[PDB]
Amino acid sequence: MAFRKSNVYLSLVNSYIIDSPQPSSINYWWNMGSLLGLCLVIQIVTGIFMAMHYSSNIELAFSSVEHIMRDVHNGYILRYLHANGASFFFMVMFMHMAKGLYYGSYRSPRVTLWNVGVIIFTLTIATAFLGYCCVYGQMSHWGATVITNLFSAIPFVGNDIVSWLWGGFSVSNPTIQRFFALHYLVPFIIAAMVIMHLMALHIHGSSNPLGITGNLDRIPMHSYFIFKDLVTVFLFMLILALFVFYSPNTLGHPDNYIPGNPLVTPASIVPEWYLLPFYAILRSIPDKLLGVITMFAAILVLLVLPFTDRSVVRGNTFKVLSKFFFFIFVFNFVLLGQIGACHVEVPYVLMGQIATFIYFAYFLIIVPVISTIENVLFYIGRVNK
Amino acid sequence: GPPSGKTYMGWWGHMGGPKQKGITSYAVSPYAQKPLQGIFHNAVFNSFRRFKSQFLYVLIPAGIYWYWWKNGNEYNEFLYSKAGREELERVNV
Amino acid sequence: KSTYRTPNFDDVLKENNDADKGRSYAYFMVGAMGLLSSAGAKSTVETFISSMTATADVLAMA
Amino acid sequence: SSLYKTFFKRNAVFVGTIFAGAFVFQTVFDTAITSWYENHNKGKLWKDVKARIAA
Amino acid sequence: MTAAEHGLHAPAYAWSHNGPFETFDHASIRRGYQVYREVCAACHSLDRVAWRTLVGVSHTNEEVRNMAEEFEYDDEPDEQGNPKKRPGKLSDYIPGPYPNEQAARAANQGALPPDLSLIVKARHGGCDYIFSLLTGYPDEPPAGVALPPGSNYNPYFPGGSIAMARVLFDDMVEYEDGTPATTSQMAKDVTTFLNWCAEPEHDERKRLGLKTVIILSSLYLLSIWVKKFKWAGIKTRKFVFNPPKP
Amino acid sequence: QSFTSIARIGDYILKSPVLSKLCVPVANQFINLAGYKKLGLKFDDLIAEENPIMQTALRRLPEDESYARAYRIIRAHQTELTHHLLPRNEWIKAQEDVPYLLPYILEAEAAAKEKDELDNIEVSK
Numbered sequence: 030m031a032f033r034k035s036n037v038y039l040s041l042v043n044s045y046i047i048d049s050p051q052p053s054s055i056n057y058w059w060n061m062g063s064l065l066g067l068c069l070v071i072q073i074v075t076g077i078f079m080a081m082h083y084s085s086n087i088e089l090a091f092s093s094v095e096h097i098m099r100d101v102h103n104g105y106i107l108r109y110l111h112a113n114g115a116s117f118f119f120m121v122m123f124m125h126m127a128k129g130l131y132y133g134s135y136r137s138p139r140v141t142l143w144n145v146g147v148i149i150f151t152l153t154i155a156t157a158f159l160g161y162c163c164v165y166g167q168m169s170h171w172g173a174t175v176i177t178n179l180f181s182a183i184p185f186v187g188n189d190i191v192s193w194l195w196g197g198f199s200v201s202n203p204t205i206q207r208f209f210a211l212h213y214l215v216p217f218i219i220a221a222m223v224i225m226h227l228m229a230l231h232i233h234g235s236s237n238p239l240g241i242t243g244n245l246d247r248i249p250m251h252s253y254f255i256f257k258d259l260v261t262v263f264l265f266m267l268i269l270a271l272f273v274f275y276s277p278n279t280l281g282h283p284d285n286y287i288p289g290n291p292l293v294t295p296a297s298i299v300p301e302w303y304l305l306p307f308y309a310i311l312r313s314i315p316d317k318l319l320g321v322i323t324m325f326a327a328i329l330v331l332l333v334l335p336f337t338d339r340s341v342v343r344g345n346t347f348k349v350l351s352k353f354f355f356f357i358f359v360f361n362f363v364l365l366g367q368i369g370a371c372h373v374e375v376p377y378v379l380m381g382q383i384a385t386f387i388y389f390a391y392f393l394i395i396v397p398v399i400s401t402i403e404n405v406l407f408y409i410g411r412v413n414k
Numbered sequence: 415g416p417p418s419g420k421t422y423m424g425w426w427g428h429m430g431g432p433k434q435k436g437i438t439s440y441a442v443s444p445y446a447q448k449p450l451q452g453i454f455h456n457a458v459f460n461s462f463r464r465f466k467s468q469f470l471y472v473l474i475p476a477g478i479y480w481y482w483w484k485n486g487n488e489y490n491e492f493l494y495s496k497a498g499r500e501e502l503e504r505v506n507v
Numbered sequence: 508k509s510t511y512r513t514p515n516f517d518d519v520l521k522e523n524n525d526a527d528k529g530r531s532y533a534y535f536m537v538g539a540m541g542l543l544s545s546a547g548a549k550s551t552v553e554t555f556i557s558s559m560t561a562t563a564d565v566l567a568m569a
Numbered sequence: 570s571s572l573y574k575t576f577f578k579r580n581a582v583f584v585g586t587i588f589a590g591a592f593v594f595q596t597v598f599d600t601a602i603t604s605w606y607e608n609h610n611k612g613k614l615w616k617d618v619k620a621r622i623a624a
Numbered sequence: 625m626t627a628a629e630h631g632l633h634a635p636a637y638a639w640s641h642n643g644p645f646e647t648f649d650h651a652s653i654r655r656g657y658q659v660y661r662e663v664c665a666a667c668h669s670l671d672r673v674a675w676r677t678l679v680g681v682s683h684t685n686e687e688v689r690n691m692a693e694e695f696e697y698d699d700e701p702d703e704q705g706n707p708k709k710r711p712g713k714l715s716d717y718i719p720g721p722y723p724n725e726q727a728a729r730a731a732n733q734g735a736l737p738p739d740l741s742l743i744v745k746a747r748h749g750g751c752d753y754i755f756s757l758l759t760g761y762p763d764e765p766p767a768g769v770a771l772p773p774g775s776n777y778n779p780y781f782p783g784g785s786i787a788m789a790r791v792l793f794d795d796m797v798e799y800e801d802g803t804p805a806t807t808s809q810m811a812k813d814v815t816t817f818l819n820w821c822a823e824p825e826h827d828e829r830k831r832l833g834l835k836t837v838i839i840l841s842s843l844y845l846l847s848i849w850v851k852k853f854k855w856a857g858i859k860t861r862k863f864v865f866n867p868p869k870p
Numbered sequence: 871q872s873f874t875s876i877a878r879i880g881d882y883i884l885k886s887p888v889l890s891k892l893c894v895p896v897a898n899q900f901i902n903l904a905g906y907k908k909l910g911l912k913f914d915d916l917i918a919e920e921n922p923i924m925q926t927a928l929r930r931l932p933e934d935e936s937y938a939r940a941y942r943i944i945r946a947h948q949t950e951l952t953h954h955l956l957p958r959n960e961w962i963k964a965q966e967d968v969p970y971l972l973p974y975i976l977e978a979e980a981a982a983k984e985k986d987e988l989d990n991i992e993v994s995k
């Protein structure tokens with residue numbers, strides 16, 4: 030047989046990237062996964078090169094990043110790639126997840142695939158938070174303060190967990206040094222989780238836009254999808270480049286260009302954009318404990334979809350009601366984000382509480398009710414007795 | 415090697431699909447085809463069709479949310495202006 | 508229908524007067540993509556490699 | 570296009586020629602861009618400001 | 625939130641450096657430095673800017689050396705261990721007016737003049753904001769506004785009450801290049817200078833972006849073409865079904 | 871949701887002249903908006919098959935219908951990838967959009983349900 034198939038190392042490459050049978054009809058929405066691997070690589074490479082010039086001590090962290098920006102040859106390119114890349118990593122992840130939601134990718138036999146994906150999402154959010162704290166700007170200090178405090182809501186031992194996470198009385202040197210060490214570690218755990226994600230993907234293969242079997246017409250990954258992936262890889266790089274070179278700070282917060290101050294929390298404090306919908310959810314609950322529980326539940330509820338989707342067909346392509354409510358969900362999510370960016374004021378507080386309800390109602394009420402109705406509609410529209 | 419669990423996808427030669435018979439396919443080398451320039455005049459009016467069926471599913475939920483957003487924002491602006499400081503004290507606490 | 512009667516591909520097929528028309532275009536595209544990629548990769552590699560050279564603030568003339 | 574068949578004759582361009590052309594491109598392209606860029610910003614550059622200074 | 629608390633939205637001025645193909649105006653940078661030295665430097669530090677970065681940007685190697693030497697910096701102790709000073713060199717960072725935070729607050733009614741090295745990037749509005757603030761002090765605050773003692777009114781600052789009084793006045797600086805030193809002209813200059821302080825890579829960054837975007841755009845258009853070619857056989861493929869007899 | 875359950879609800883509606891005249895027209899409009907018929911598919915071709923019930927059912931399907939399902943599915947993927955719909959004259963007509971796999975599915979679900987019942991039968995003395 031060909032060497033690519035006989036060699037122990039190359040056969041892995043062959044089965045995953047060359048001869049892997051792909052359903053002939055997958056569309057550009059199936060290009061997000063490769064884009065995520067590319068994002069992971071960009072974050073790791075740029076972070077290691079910057080680590081070479083970074084000091085984690087709380088007294089030097091902010092200046093060491095300014096040093097990367099001013100004195101390191103091409104340093105600003107590395108930092109801007111890393112920062113803007115993190116944002117692009119989230120934009121693509123949301124699209125990858127939304128694609129799964131729309132096409133019923135979370136369904137059997139891909140439940141394990143979906144569950145591992147949820148874990149990766151949690152780890153990615155934690156990784157970005159740890160990195161954000163390393164800059165040690167104003168948003169870094171308060172973000173670290175607020176987020177480590179999320180654990181104080183745990184009854185009895187909560188405050189002990191926080192003092193342990195901090196390594197002291199408050200967010201200080203011990204805190205930033207351990208957050209940098211952890212920021213360096215997690216990306217590699219994410220890499221291992223991605224391999225487990227690809228392993229689950231390999232046993233059943235990708236799904237397709239029709240939601241039915243792809244077994245009757247497959248085409249090799251090599252050539253077709255390798256070059257098709259190339260198309261979105263360049264488009265992705267072009268757009269990332271426009272931000273990195275022409276508008277590098279548009280997706281960030283001006284307060285992070287101010288060294289962290291333990292005695293003053295800016296009135297302008299706003300979480301990173303990709304965290305806004307979750308932030309809004311927490312803010313909508315006027316209780317400390319319930320606020321943090323509901324926010325975490327907003328992520329874990331994604332695990333419920335394989336069970337609440339009662340439909341007999343995979344995906345929303347041929348489902349009028351499901352398509353409509355899917356978009357209600359998407360735009361409701363964007364609203365949650367817009368609410369997160371707003372002040373805790375009158376119209377906003379109530380809108381956030383209603384949007385929060387709609388968010389949970391989608392998975393727990395709308396999908397099971399609507400999918401059941403659609404099941405019945407499909408039946409009575411053709412059975413003549 | 416070690417026994418592998420049954421799945422819903424095999425490999426070339428045993429994909430796991432049903433036995434096919436009666437279907438005949440035809441194709442022509444990309445080399446023998448008209449170089450990329452014909453995707454117009456014949457493939458232009460045909461396009462844009464796969465969004466004429468979908469835009470309503472996107473637009474209506476979008477409209478509902480944009481309106482809801484605009485309304486709440488304009489109301490907040492009123493509440494914090496001179497004219498609305500009376501209503502503000504009412505709806506606030 | 509008889510399998511010997513090949514369906515119509517006229518709308519796709521080029522009126523062959525220039526045999527290597529599609530080939531020359533494809534190979535030029537592939538060749539140009541290979542060129543710009545190699546230059547891009549070289550520039551990317553140099554960008555990262557040069558970040559490790561002496562920083563602007565350490566080139567003090569004692 | 571017969572222009573292609575004169576240099577490469579129905580065969581694809583080989584890596585060596587691709588690599589060689591890339592080194593050439595890099596230099597040419599950079600000068601072309603720097604020239605246009607500096608010209609587009611004539612008057613604002615330090616080169617221009619230094620000319621109006623004498624010390 | 626009330627307009628006063630939010631602060632007046634700064635309008636968009638036509639900065640010569642706005643635009644993808646535009647570099648900073650280096651003459652304005654040069655002038656901006658003078659305004660900083662003669663006005664701002666009395667209360668504002670510029671800690672992240674090293675003398676050497678001025679060379680080839682706004683001043684000559686000689687001019688910067690003279691400027692650095694006007695300041696004394698701590699040197700290495702002598703043969704006997706006693707401390708000693710030294711004139712400044714290009715490797716040094718522009719010195720600040722105050723020795724520590726406490727001394728800075730004492731000289732400003734308890735307020736702390738922030739360092740201006742990043743001020744342009746550390747505020748929404750960027751150049752538009754900084755400029756508007758400097759040229760937006762009304763001779764008298766709007767009717768009804770109870771301004772605290774030692775404070776000043778400026779509509780562009782959140783809350784309207786700012787601890788920095790107007791400091792730019794017509795002809796308070798004599799521009800080396802003969803330019804009329806009006807307040808709006810001086811504001812336009814320091815702001816341009818401060819943008820460079822915060823973004824020294826600006827001109828070079830946009831030049832690299834131009835090359836990067838051209839190469840990537842081409843690669844993008846090219847890949848589309850290559851993909852369509854590699855897929856032509858599949859896209860135009862045709863099927864026929866002849867039901868098998870039993 | 872099992873097909874036995876969909877049938878229970880669906881038949882109850884179909885028998886009652888009250889609901890039958892109210893719902894069917896809605897259902898008919900839903901089916902046309904779905905659009906699967908424009909791709910040359912029958913609803914039963916759309917049922918997710920990666921489960922034992924559907925495998926048992928597809929296994930029991932007579933040859934001729936099996937080869938037909940195969941052609942429809944392949945034809946649908948090719949049309950989908952070309953981002954077109956089939957020429958109107960090739961669309962599946964409502965008369966053809968018959969639940970051909972349904973009887974095999976219902977039979978398999980009943981057989982399955984009985985095994986589950988018998989494996990868990992209690993005994994009273």
Ligand code: HEM
Pocket residue numbers: 068069072073075076077079080083094108111112115118153156157158159160161162163164212213216219281
């Ligand atoms: C998927 C992985 C990663 C993500 C999502 C990520 C994300 C981030 C984020 C959001 C920041 C702050 C950006 C800013 O400055 O505003 C950051 C900073 C940083 N990251 Fe990462 N990071 C990742 C991997 C890595 C790795 C492996 C390293 C290797 C050491 C690393 C090193 C750093 C350093 C040194 C900083 C500080 C410099 C800076 O602010 O850009 N990162 N990261």
Ligand code: HEM
Pocket residue numbers: 058059060061062063065066069122125126129132133134135139142143145146147149150223226230234235236237
């Ligand atoms: C770093 C993150 C990730 C990487 C590198 C990754 C990569 C991939 C790849 C290569 C594919 C195949 C191509 C595609 O369908 O796009 C895939 C499929 C899939 N992924 Fe991910 N993924 C990531 C995160 C996630 C997350 C966060 C989820 C969900 C919460 C998820 C859910 C899925 C599912 C369900 C599929 C199958 C889609 C289908 O075939 O219909 N992935 N992923």
Ligand code: HEM
Pocket residue numbers: 659660663664665666667668732735736737738743747754757758781785786787788789791792814
């Ligand atoms: C044209 C020269 C100057 C420039 C460019 C300038 C610029 C600025 C800027 C941008 C701020 C920050 C305002 C904000 O938080 O948004 C500020 C604050 C301040 N400046 Fe200046 N300044 C100048 C001269 C002066 C002088 C000479 C003094 C000392 C008499 C002074 C004292 C202060 C003080 C006390 C603050 C604190 C404001 C507060 O916290 O309320 N500045 N200046």
Ligand SMILES: COc1c(O)c(C)c(C/C=C(\C)CC/C=C(\C)CC/C=C(/C)CC/C=C(\C)CC/C=C(\C)CCC=C(C)C)c(O)c1OC
Pocket residue numbers: 045046049051059060062063066067069070073074077220223224227230231234235254258
């Ligand atoms: C069936 O479905 C599939 C499918 O199976 C596959 C495989 C793909 C193709 C996509 C992929 C395989 C994506 C895979 C990506 C990854 C596994 C990324 C893993 C991440 C990493 C970060 C790798 C680790 C990297 C390093 C150790 C290098 C970094 C450090 C360096 C270079 C050292 C620097 C230091 C010095 C001193 C020079 C598809 O697109 C697809 O659907 C269409």
Ligand SMILES: C/C=C(C)/C=C/C=C/C(OC)[C@@H](C)[C@H](OC)[C@@H](C)CCc1oc2c(O)c(OC)cc(OC)c2c(=O)c1C
Pocket residue numbers: 151152154155158168169171172175176177194211298299300301304307308311324325
């Ligand atoms: C060693 C690792 C540790 C201790 C922690 C890791 C795990 C934590 C998370 O998830 C993994 C966590 C990021 C959370 O996830 C639920 C996100 C949605 C956070 C959402 C979030 O962000 C904020 C933020 O960014 C801010 O910046 C200025 C400020 C903030 O208040 C004003 C917030 C905030 O109020 C919330 C809820």
Ligand SMILES: CCCCCCCCCCCO[C@@H]1O[C@H](CO)[C@@H](O[C@H]2O[C@H](CO)[C@@H](O)[C@H](O)[C@H]2O)[C@H](O)[C@H]1O
Pocket residue numbers: 537541544545548579580581582583584585587
């Ligand atoms: C990841 C970093 C990027 C590195 C650079 C990217 C890769 C560039 C590769 C450039 C040239 O690679 C080149 O490809 C062409 C095919 O396209 C090969 O050509 C081969 O196939 C073509 C096409 O059937 C035949 O006409 C030709 O006679 C044959 O030799 C050529 O021998 C190889 O040398």
